[PDB]
């Protein structure tokens, strides 16, 4: 699996609901080895998300500096584990939002490889 393809599996849902995160965290394999605690899905075209790597260069939350913030806010869905969630029985709360996405980009072609934050 390439880094770019892993970002698409974990974070892109361009074609698309309070069960959404429970359905999607399982279908994208994010409950397989552990309950991935927080994960965001983006409901914008893949072209529009890839274009963020040409938008505003900002620091990543860990201090790396190859992150990029979208000039427009985007339709996103935050998936966050519930208080009862415990692996192997993962459970998620779904929250829809409209926020600027921040991604780390790598490669040539230069594309998103990590979803960092929304602001």
């Amino acid at each position: 699996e390439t880094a770019a393809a892993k970002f698409e599996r974990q974070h892109m849902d361009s074609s698309t609901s309070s069960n959404y995160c429970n359905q999607m965290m399982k279908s994208r394999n994010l409950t397989k080895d552990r309950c991935k605690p927080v994960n965001t899905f983006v409901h914008e075209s893949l072209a529009d998300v890839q274009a963020v790597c040409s938008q505003k260069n900002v620091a990543c939350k860990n201090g790396q500096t190859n992150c990029y913030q979208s000039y427009s806010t985007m339709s996103i869905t935050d998936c966050r584990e519930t208080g009862s969630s415990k692996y192997p029985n993962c459970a998620y709360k779904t929250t829809q939002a409209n926020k600027h996405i921040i991604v780390a980009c790598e490669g040539n072609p230069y594309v998103p490889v990590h979803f960092d934050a929304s602001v």
Partner: nanobody
Amino acid sequence: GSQVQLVESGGGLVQAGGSLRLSCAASGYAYTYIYMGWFRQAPGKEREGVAAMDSGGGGTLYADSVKGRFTISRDKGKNTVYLQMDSLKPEDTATYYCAAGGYELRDRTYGQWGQGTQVTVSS
């Protein structure tokens, strides 16, 4: 100026022991690139990071082979990065590339690249 362009100048042919400066100025990007740097690809070798510096003039990193001979600076213009190269050695012969928007000397993290400027150090 719809396209980002990393304009490279300086470099070229020089005798061993001599000096050159490489200059890079980005145009077409409205904000500040946090990291800029210089990479090179020498004959027979993979591309490597040579020097990089953050927009505050800090986070400065050099390839071990050039520490104490090359000096990177960003104090000469917004999104500009310069490399003073002293005491040049034949093994510094390479295509040098300006890069912007990445992290430290990690090539895969940079998304904007100059076209490449030849530096040739003769004996």
